[PDB]
Design a protein around this ligand. Structure first.
Ligand SMILES: Cc1cc2nc3c(=O)[nH]c(=O)nc-3n(C[C@H](O)[C@H](O)[C@H](O)COP(=O)(O)O)c2cc1C
Ligand code: SF4
Ligand code: SF4
Ligand code: SF4
Ligand code: SF4
Ligand code: SF4
Ligand code: FES
Ligand code: FES
Ligand SMILES: [Zn+2]
Lengths: 689, 121, 185, 115, 309, 105, 114, 67, 231
């Protein structure tokens, strides 16, 4: 299972039958490459990674020559170097001259690795023309210049293997290979926008970023994703006030190379309609005002209404930070009561799995172990519509291994061959007792993934007690070294919200609200409003909620702060700010501390570290980062998630509706971008065939 | 230290290592061309010296603390402004807030070279 | 210049196949294992080609639907093969070999004779839509190098006189001919 | 500990970041892997505002753009405690071994087929 | 210092034009030094007469550089661009008269009894002390050690040109005057033979990995564009390590000490200036004089304080 | 932020904005310091948006169009570098260095 | 000289915001912002030269590949405010529109040497 | 100075042997059609001033309230 | 398997192993088929002994050379992808594999094309360049851009636009494609031009003599000017 090979004095042992480039990169030897990639299948196309191997007449392609035991491998024979110059010359004398106006100026990997391996006189005459290539439209989200495509075929392999939209095929021979389609139809798939970070030349590129920047002006900054519960691995390109674009950084457990395609275009959703100043309504006449004026107006209105007991319904918004939610819960409990629910359509009730025993709550299997699962089934969700990179790992496993996959509930087209078994709870219990009671018990480490959309419904009862009772009642695999019972969330911060323990408590839920803390709660805001509203909308990008507001608080978004976030697997991941907040726009937990000053019940903590100290005092899984093992309550948690909500709700046969209609317009950032409006109207006959 | 021969037309270099904490002795006891240069070394670094007369500042402002060629504090400096209107002619500093920050160069290619070594032995 | 062009010019997914073609297609598919089942795609495109000349995007989409395939892989097959003519083509596709032995025995003058007869640039078709020119490379048959092929078969050993007689005849009268004489020696 | 040559009150006020520079996903090439970076945060009110006359971005951070390039994380952190300000370290993330038979172009009975 | 650290060598056209430009620069520096010296001493006419052909040397920069006196004309990879024709034709006709006018400014200072008591054995610096002071250049060779760099560590084609170096005998300011006044009429020979021996060849470096591509074929070629692009974005690769390089600037030995990271930007550069060493020696030299002695002894040792730091 | 105007200038020879986010209002452009001033400070850009409509479309019956932009009096190369563009579909007549429109006929 | 922006014959504002003239201005006196303009190509949204801090190294001219920023020979200066020095896009396009005759003489004696 | 139309400014600074009213093929790139030539306006009330071209970078929200 | 190497299989399993081993060389063996075409007297096809004189092969079985033995200019042996033997070292070599492999020619197809001396070798090899342009697949990066650049060069060599060093530049760029593909189609494209620089260059220079000022003074107004290659 290990083999020594010698690359130029560097002996190194790697696994048998592996890739020679993997040996070179383990040996710390830089080998130039264009059509190799890590998480794609190997093609021999780019012909650059040539290396000299003993007992071989030709320098073989190190991307695909498998590891033979005990090889002598030279990357520095003059045949190798003075053939690499040869191959780079014969890659460049049909490339166009777009280098000043090609988007990847300091990132054309061809251009980057040209000077140290290349050759000056690309031989030409005015008589000679190279060739031209027809530009092609792949979608209004991706700008495309196919003149530059060096036919690395990384795009094709990505659209086939990982994306599952095979609509980007190759075409033609000779000079006349074009990539895309000659039906001229737009790609409208999930995670399409990974491909512009993937084509190593600037043939594919970003449409709203198109020419705005060029990568040495850019304070490239580590941060954590939003608009998905997975807490993806982003990195923000910043010009200093504006945010230019995002790049998915590498993080091998959680979504190793990819971004959710909604998360790629928060930049056009950021700098467009932010709340820069507090706004107050005279009434249908909505004027901005001084900060202290608005604070004193809020405190004076609180003293006017005096909502002392079991009132002032704060509600967890979609996209916030843990520290603001800690300030929210602590300020409400300091003020006198507890009424904090979430955005969900009538989730003014417990999520039918207790805040006790953390393992019951989140996606407690590892994201990598998804490709270690024998056969899984999904209920109440469309994982293409939510957490698209989770769908990417699903397809990665489904092409790798043999998995029996079934959807139950919503009718979904996902690219890994589900077997839908009804739109009803009775169909669910039938399918569990019928044949997956054989499969999941017979299989080795199965998983069972549930949507958040079922927790929205009043059918969080018998529908959810059925699957919990099945988890207990099939205890043979799902107890000790594996935990299949898992849910996903729509938003990221709802995971940390249920971690801190926002309570929907029925002693307080059966009352009417008279003060409302909206934190971006665009979804629930049409219903939950009284006449005596006094809606305090804190946040940014006032799409919905500011339109229902009484006082606007211009909160800073995720980009401008060190928002410690929780994924849907319980990992704490801490951010960094990449720009200051625009305008007045102070930071959110500081806003709630100042409200605690004016609405005169002050918090016991005000500096930066004190927030983290109280957060450690609340749940110390959130101060130790990105490493979770909840092995201790794998068995008692399903008892305490089953017996509680048992039979309080008769199983309603209302069908399992689609959780998200428009994926592209969500979350009060992606809700409000002219990128996502264009991609949302990319549904038409152009996409269909 | 770079030294120069006269009879032999031959340079040499001589290195020590010193910490901001602990000094290393000067070489002004041997000749007189030192006591200006070691002032320059002290001013640019805070590499403190020893056995030396007149270890002043030359290369900065006279009330200016910090040491510039340490890679601790950047190009702007901490307090570098000057203005004189109200407290008259007292050209007193502030927090140095520039008018456009030195937008850096943070690009880097694959790898420069591997050296073709040569030694006599 | 084998091009990969649009699909606008009145070829917009409206066609099918016919009765005996589906039976013959099932006969073709039966030569291939039941799982891992694509490899009949090239002869099935030939059956579509002989059913409907100038194999359009429509019959290709019908094949891709028929053999459970995503369509771009079928396009990726029919982007290679010069058999799969796309533009509308006349009754007799006229393929002149202009490769090296065919060059060295005078197919150059044969193409000159054809373009004197049919004033057509060698990548175009006749306005009558009776003939469509294509210079082609070596069909293997370097037997009598001034040969050409016409839409099915090979006509060995052509003088320009025999060529223009064939262009007169293949307007109406068929010439089931290898060559003027019989044998190869 | 008192700072000897640091005239600011940096040492009590700001959070600094020790991080391995991330592997860029756009280019292939990995020279940013082999450093360690010190970076002061922008957790500020100064924090690069907008100018009003020409419209540059005049900052207020006297040490906005500054990067050390260290060698080892523990040498980095021994410096960071030696000159003495509040840090936060960030662990890098590798890429995991996966065996790549180039021959992954073969099947049994199975529905899906690829390029 | 950089091209030593690149292991490259500029072609012969580049070495000859940098050598002749180094020697008109030497004419310019010693001319402005003697002129500002004599203005501080008190005579105004040598100052203005010398600036009259400093203006011609300003033009000879200007027909090459982009400005009058500062220039980005040298590069690490050789220079910016080859000369224009009328420059090389004119510079002979300049050097035809410059010896005559150098004699003309020489006739009223070198001989008079003023400069013979205005400069006496004044600021005598012995060689045992001058070596111990870190002095160099004109004051060193005024103290009678026949050593510079150019004849002794020959950078950039001073090897190939007949070059004779004046040597002092007395370490005063008078030989420090006369040694500059000899270096004029030694540098004019260099301008003569570099007008004669001027080859034809590439005036940048030969490859295009390191300096700049030629601007003609940067618009007809892929590779010329990528080299142009990266040479003006990321600078370029420099191999790691240290170096130090000293040449005799006309104020003394300038040293450049560069520690290169192995990256786009120099990890450390330390200059070394004769105007920072001679200024350091000034206290040991100035003792036992008067103030109008000290005014002259500033100007002798080339104290232009833009070469302090 | 108040009520004041001086109707003497549109955007350019073109009437409206030249591109995305290039405004021509003056009040947001700090009307404090335009006062006592001629308005004959230079509005000289003619907004090259208008100058492609000045330009006539060029036809090439090949398939690949070379573009230089260089003059036929200059001794040195002065135009934009040699981009080869395609004339294949009608519409893509755009040399991305000059905006000269190349149509296939 | 003073940084006049050239255009083509019938000029479509020859600068493409290619940012090469940014990355070598050794006092960072260049501040550019760019955008895809309406007609498809890329143009300069704003173009900024700190004539406070332009050393006149000419590297801007030595690297702008379409030869669109050009050092003039004109010494036409001496403003009374800094606010009359900070050249925006309109000043430079105006300055190139004021003369290209002199610049055409300059390039046609220099471009076979640049 | 600056009353000189700057095509002649070489011929007053010796940028060319030939007077600029000689060659027509060198002299004509001009179809940027007006040539108004403001000399210099410094100290004059109509001095040049400057301004950001674009708009603010962040685009504050518009106060629209629903019910 | 090749169709001809499997066509002999039942006959060679009904006859003995010594039957096929009776012929040719000590390592090369048996009879192989010959398709003889090009500008010859009688274009024909036979199935004959390996290791025969090519002159006896032409003269005894296919008429001969159209023009006779003193009117060839080159012979293409074996494949299309084989270098051309000259008129003197085609006289007495063999028709095997291994000895002709020692005369640089791997006769892997055994299909012989013979040319009159009154015809252009340049047009033949240029036609092979266009052949590989129609037949390069697309996976190899060097093969496509290679064949395109070779076609662009051989058009210049037909018309005589090249310079004397461009011959060796062409040889170097053919050496660039000599071992750097996936399949041997690129090597097959690299063989005829490497055969062109071998045994030849009086006639490259003779065609290039037929005008002056190579890389001619042109302008490229909207298309190119002053010359063009094929369109
Ligand atoms: C680019 C290339 C093209 C080839 N074309 C043919 C062909 O058209 N007909 C043929 O019989 N062999 C052809 N071959 C040789 C095949 O590889 C052949 O099937 C192989 O040599 C089988 O060996 P065999 O002769 O023992 O059967 C080609 C080889 C290469 C590299
Ligand atoms: S990909 Fe674009 S930026 Fe990179 S070398 Fe090619 S043309 Fe230039
Ligand atoms: S689409 Fe991009 S990544 Fe894919 S082959 Fe083309 S240029 Fe390469
Ligand atoms: S001339 Fe020099 S200082 Fe001025 S903008 Fe150009 S590069 Fe910068
Ligand atoms: S160098 Fe050219 S393309 Fe780049 S910003 Fe300057 S004028 Fe524009
Ligand atoms: S040699 Fe083969 S694989 Fe390579 S490009 Fe040519 S046909 Fe394709
Ligand atoms: S990936 Fe290794 S050669 Fe193309
Ligand atoms: S010679 Fe052309 S077909 Fe065989
Ligand atoms: Zn153009």
């Amino acid at each position: 299972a290990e083999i020594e090979l010698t690359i130029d004095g560097h002996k190194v042992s790697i696994e048998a039958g592996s890739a020679l480039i993997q040996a070179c990169e383990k040996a710390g030897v830089t080998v130039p490459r264009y059509c190799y990639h890590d998480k794609l299948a190997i093609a021999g196309n780019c012909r650059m990674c040539l290396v000299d191997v003993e007992r071989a007449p030709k320098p073989v392609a190190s991307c695909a020559y498998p590891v033979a035991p005990g090889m002598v491998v030279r990357t520095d024979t003059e045949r190798v170097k003075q053939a690499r110059e040869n191959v780079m010359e014969m890659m460049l004398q049909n490339h166009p001259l777009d280098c000043p106006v090609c988007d990847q100026g300091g990132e054309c990997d061809l251009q980057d690795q040209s000077m140290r391996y290349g050759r000056d006189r690309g031989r030409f005459t005015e008589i000679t023309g190279k060739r031209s290539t027809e530009d092609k439209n792949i979608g209004p989200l991706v700008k495309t210049s196919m003149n530059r495509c060096i036919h690395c075929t990384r795009c094709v392999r990505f659209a086939n293997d990982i994306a599952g939209a095979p609509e980007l095929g190759s075409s033609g021979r000779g000079n006349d290979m074009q990539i895309g389609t000659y039906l001229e139809k737009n790609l409208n798939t999930e995670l399409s926008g990974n491909v512009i970070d993937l084509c190593p030349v600037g043939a594919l590129t970003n449409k709203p970023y198109a020419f705005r920047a060029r990568p040495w002006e850019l304070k490239k900054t580590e941060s954590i994703d939003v608009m998905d519960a997975v807490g993806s691995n982003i990195r923000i390109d910043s010009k200093g006030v504006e945010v230019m674009r995002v790049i998915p950084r590498v993080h091998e457990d959680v979504n190793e190379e990819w971004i959710n395609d909604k998360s790629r275009f928060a930049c056009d959703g950021l700098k467009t309609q932010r709340l820069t100043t507090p706004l107050i309504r005279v009434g249908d006449k909505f004027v901005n005002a001084t900060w202290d004026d608005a604070l004193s107006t809020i405190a004076k209105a609180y003293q006017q209404k005096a909502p002392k007991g079991d009132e002032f319904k704060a509600v967890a918004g979609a996209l916030v930070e843990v520290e603001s939610m800690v300030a929210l819960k602590d300020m409400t409990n300091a003020l006198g009561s507890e009424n904090t629910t979430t955005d969900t359509p009538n989730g003014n009730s417990a999520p039918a799995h207790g805040i006790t025993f953390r393992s019951n709550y989140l996606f407690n299997s590892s994201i990598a172990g998804i490709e270690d699962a024998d056969a899984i089934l999904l209920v109440g969700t469309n994982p293409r519509r939510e957490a698209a990179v989770m769908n990417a790992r699903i397809r990665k496993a489904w092409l790798r291994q043999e998995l029996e996959i079934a959807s139950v509930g919503p009718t979904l087209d996902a690219t890994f061959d589900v077997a839908e078994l009804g739109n009803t709870h009775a169909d669910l219990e039938k399918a569990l007792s019928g044949e997956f009671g054989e499969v999941l018990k017979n299989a080795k480490n199965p998983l069972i993934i549930v949507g958040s959309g079922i927790t929205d419904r009043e059918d969080a009862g018998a529908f959810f007690n059925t699957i919990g009772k099945f988890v207990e009642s099939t205890p043979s695999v799902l107890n000790e070294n594996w935990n299949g019972y898992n849910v996903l969330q729509r938003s990221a911060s709802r995971a940390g919200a249920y971690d801190i323990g926002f309570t929907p408590s029925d002693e307080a839920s059966k009352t009417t609200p008279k003060m409302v803390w909206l934190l971006g709660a665009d979804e629930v805001a049409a219903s939950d409003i009284p006449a005596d509203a006094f809606v305090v909308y804190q946040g940014h990008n006032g799409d919905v909620g500011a339109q229902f507001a009484d006082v606007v608080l211009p909160g800073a978004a995720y980009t401008e702060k060190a928002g410690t976030y929780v994924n849907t697997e319980g990992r704490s991941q801490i951010s960094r700010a990449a720009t200051g907040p625009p305008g007045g726009a102070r930071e959110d937990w500081k806003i709630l501390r100042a409200v605690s000053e004016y609405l005169g019940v002050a918090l016991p903590y005000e500096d930066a570290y004190e927030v983290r100290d109280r957060l450690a005092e609340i749940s110390p899984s959130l101060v130790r980062y990105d490493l979770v093992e909840p092995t201790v309550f794998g068995d008692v948690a399903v008892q305490h998630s089953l017996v509680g909500p048992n039979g309080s709700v008769t199983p309603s046969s209302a069908p399992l509706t689609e959780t998200i209609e428009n994926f592209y317009m969500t979350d009060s950032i992606s809700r409000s971008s002219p990128t996502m409006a264009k991609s949302s109207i990319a549904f038409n006959k152009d996409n269909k065939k | 230290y770079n030294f120069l021969s006269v009879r032999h037309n031959s340079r040499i270099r001589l290195k020590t290592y010193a910490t901001e904490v602990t000094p290393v002795p000067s070489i002004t006891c041997l000749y007189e061309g030192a006591n200006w240069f070691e002032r320059e070394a002290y001013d640019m670094y805070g590499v403190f010296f020893e056995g030396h007369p007149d270890l002043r500042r030359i290369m900065t402002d006279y009330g200016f603390e910090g040491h510039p060629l340490r890679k601790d504090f950047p190009l702007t400096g901490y307090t570098e402004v000057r203005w004189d209107e109200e407290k008259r002619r007292v050209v007193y500093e502030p927090l140095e807030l520039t008018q456009a920050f030195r937008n850096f160069s943070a690009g880097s290619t694959a790898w420069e070279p591997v050296g073709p070594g040569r030694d006599d032995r | 210049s084998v091009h990969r062009n649009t699909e606008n010019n009145n070829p917009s997914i409206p066609f099918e196949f016919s009765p005996e073609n589906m039976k013959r297609a099932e006969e073709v598919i039966a030569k291939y294992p039941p799982q891992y089942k694509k490899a009949a795609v090239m002869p099935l495109l030939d059956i579509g080609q002989r059913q409907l000349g100038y194999t359009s995007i429509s019959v290709m989409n019908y094949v891709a639907k028929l053999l459970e395939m995503p369509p771009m892989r079928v396009y990726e097959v029919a982007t290679f093969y010069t058999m799969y003519n796309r533009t509308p083509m006349g009754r007799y596709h006229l393929q002149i070999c202009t490769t090296t032995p065919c060059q060295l025995c005078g197919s150059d003058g044969i193409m000159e004779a054809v373009q004197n007869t049919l004033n057509i640039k060698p990548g175009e078709t006749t306005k009558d839509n009776l003939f469509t020119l294509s210079e082609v490379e070596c069909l293997g048959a370097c037997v009598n190098a001034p040969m050409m092929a016409i839409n099915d078969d090979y006509y060995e050993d052509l003088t320009p006189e025999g060529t223009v007689k064939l262009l007169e005849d293949c307007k109406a009268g068929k010439m089931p001919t290898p060559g003027p004489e019989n044998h190869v020696r | 500990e008192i700072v000897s040559g640091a005239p600011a009150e940096l040492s009590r006020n700001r959070v600094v970041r020790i991080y391995q520079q991330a592997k860029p996903a756009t280019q292939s090439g990995e020279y940013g892997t082999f450093a360690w970076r010190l970076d002061w945060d922008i957790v500020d009110v100064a924090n690069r505002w907008e100018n009003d006359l020409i419209g540059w971005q005049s900052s207020g951070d006297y040490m906005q753009a500054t990067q050390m390039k260290f060698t080892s994380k523990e040498s980095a952190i021994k410096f960071a405690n030696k000159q003495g300000w509040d840090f936060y370290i960030q662990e890098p993330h590798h890429r995991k071994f996966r065996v790549k038979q180039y021959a992954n172009n073969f099947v049994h009975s199975y529905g899906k087929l690829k390029h | 210092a950089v091209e030593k650290l690149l292991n490259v060598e500029v072609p012969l056209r580049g070495k000859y034009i940098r050598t002749m430009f180094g020697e008109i620069t030497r004419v310019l520096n010693h001319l402005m030094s003697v002129c500002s010296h004599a203005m501080d001493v008190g005579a105004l006419t040598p100052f203005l007469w010398g600036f009259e052909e400093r203006e011609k040397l300003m033009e000879f920069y200007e027909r090459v550089s982009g400005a009058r006196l500062h220039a980005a004309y040298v590069r690490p990879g050789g220079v910016s661009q080859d000369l224009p024709a009328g420059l090389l034709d004119d510079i002979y006709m300049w050097a035809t008269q410059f010896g005559d006018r150098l004699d003309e400014i020489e006739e009223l200072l070198t001989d008079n009894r003023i400069w013979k008591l205005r400069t006496v054995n004044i600021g005598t610096v012995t060689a045992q002390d001058a070596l111990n002071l870190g002095l160099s250049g004109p004051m060193l060779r005024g103290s009678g050690i026949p050593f510079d760099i150019r004849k002794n560590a020959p950078y950039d084609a001073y090897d190939k040109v007949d070059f004779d170096v004046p040597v002092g005998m007395n370490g005063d300011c008078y030989d420090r005057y006369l040694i500059r006044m000899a270096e004029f009429r030694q540098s004019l020979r260099i301008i003569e033979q570099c007008c004669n021996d001027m080859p034809a060849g590439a005036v940048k470096v030969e490859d295009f990995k390191i300096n700049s591509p030629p601007r003609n074929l940067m618009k007809e070629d892929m590779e010329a564009l990528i080299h142009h692009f990266l040479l003006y974005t990321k600078g370029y690769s420099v191999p790691p390590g240290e170096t130090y390089t000293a040449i005799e600037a006309p104020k003394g030995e300038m040293g450049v000490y560069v520690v290169s990271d192995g990256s786009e930007r120099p990890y450390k550069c330390k200059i070394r200036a004769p105007g920072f060493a001679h200024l350091g020696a000034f206290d040991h030299i100035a003792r036992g004089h008067f103030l109008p002695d000290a005014v002259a002894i500033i100007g002798t040792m080339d104290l232009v304080f833009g070469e302090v730091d | 932020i108040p009520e004041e105007y001086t109707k003497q200038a549109p955007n350019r020879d073109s009437t409206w904005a030249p591109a995305q986010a290039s405004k021509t209002e003056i009040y947001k452009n700090n009307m404090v310091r335009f006062e006592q001033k001629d308005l004959s400070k230079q509005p000289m850009p003619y907004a090259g948006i208008e100058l492609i409509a000045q330009q006539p479309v060029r036809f090439v019956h090949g398939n690949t169009a070379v573009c230089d932009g260089a003059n036929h009096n200059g001794p040195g190369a002065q135009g934009h570098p040699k981009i080869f563009i395609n004339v294949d579909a009608p519409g893509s007549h755009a040399c991305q260095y000059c905006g000269t429109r190349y149509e296939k006929e | 000289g003073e940084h006049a922006l050239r255009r083509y014959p019938s000029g479509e504002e020859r600068c493409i915001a290619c940012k090469l003239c940014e990355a070598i201005c050794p006092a960072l006196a260049i501040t550019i912002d760019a955008e895809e303009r309406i007609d498809g190509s890329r143009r300069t949204t704003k173009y900024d030269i700190d004539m406070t801090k332009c050393i006149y190294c000419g590297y801007c001219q030595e690297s702008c590949p379409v030869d669109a920023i050009v050092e003039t020979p004109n010494v036409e200066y001496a403003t009374e405010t800094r606010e009359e020095l900070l050249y925006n896009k309109e000043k430079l396009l105006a300055n190139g529109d004021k003369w290209e005759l002199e610049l055409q003489y300059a390039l046609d004696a220099d471009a076979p040497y640049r | 100075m600056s009353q000189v139309e700057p095509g002649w400014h070489f011929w007053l600074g010796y940028g060319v042997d030939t007077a600029p009213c000689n060659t027509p093929k060198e002299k004509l790139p001009i179809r940027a059609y007006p040539y108004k030539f403001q000399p210099n306006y410094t100290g004059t009330p109509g001095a040049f001033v400057t301004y950001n071209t674009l708009k603010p970078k962040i685009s504050a929200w518009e106060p629209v309230t629903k019910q | 398997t090749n169709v001809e190497t499997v066509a002999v299989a039942p006959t060679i399993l009904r006859r003995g192993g010594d039957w096929f081993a009776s012929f040719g060389r000590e390592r090369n063996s048996g009879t192989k088929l010959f398709c003889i075409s090009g500008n010859v007297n009688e274009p024909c096809t036979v199935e004959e002994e390996m290791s025969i004189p090519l002159r006896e092969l032409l003269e005894k079985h296919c008429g001969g050379i159209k023009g006779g033995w003193d009117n060839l200019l080159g012979v293409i042996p074996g494949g299309c992808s084989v270098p051309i033997l000259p008129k003197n070292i085609c006289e007495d070599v063999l028709m095997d594999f291994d000895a002709l492999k020692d005369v640089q020619s791997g006769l892997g197809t055994a299909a012989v094309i013979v040319i009159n001396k009154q015809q252009d070798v340049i047009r033949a090899i240029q036609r092979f360049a266009a052949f590989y342009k129609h037949e390069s697949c697309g996976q190899c990066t060097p093969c496509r851009e290679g064949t395109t650049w070779l076609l662009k060069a051989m058009d210049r060599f037909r018309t005589g636009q090249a310079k004397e060093r461009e011959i060796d530049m062409l040889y170097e760029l053919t050496k660039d494609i000599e071992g750097h593909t996936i399949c041997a189609l690129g090597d097959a494209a690299a063989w005829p031009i490497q055969g062109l620089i071998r045994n030849f260059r009086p006639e490259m220079e003779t065609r290039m003599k037929k005008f002056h000022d190579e890389v001619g003074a042109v302008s490229v107004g909207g298309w190119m000017k002053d010359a063009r290659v094929e369109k």
